[PDB]
Structure 1
Amino acid sequence: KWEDWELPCYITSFLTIVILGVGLNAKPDLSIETWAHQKALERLEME
Structure 2
Amino acid sequence: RPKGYFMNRTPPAPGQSRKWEDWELPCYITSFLTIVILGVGLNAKPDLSIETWAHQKALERLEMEKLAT
TM-score normalized with structure 1 length: 0.43
Moved over 2 A (4+): 1-24
The count of aligned residue pairs is 47
Structure richer in helix, relative to its length: 2
When the two structures are superposed, what TM-score results if normalisation uses the length of structure 2? Answer: 0.35
Task: State the identity %.
Answer: 100
In structure 2, runs of 5+ residues without a counterpart are 1-18
Task: Mark the CA change 1:24 to 1:6 in structure 2 (over 3 Å): closer, same or farther.
Answer: same
Aligned to 2:38, the other structure's residue is in SS state: helix
Which structure 2 residues correspond to residues 14-33 of structure 1 after superposition, within 5 A? Answer: 14-33=32-51
Q: Tell me: higher relative CO, structure 1 or 2? Use CA pairs within 8 A at least 6 residues apart.
A: 1
Larger Rg: 2
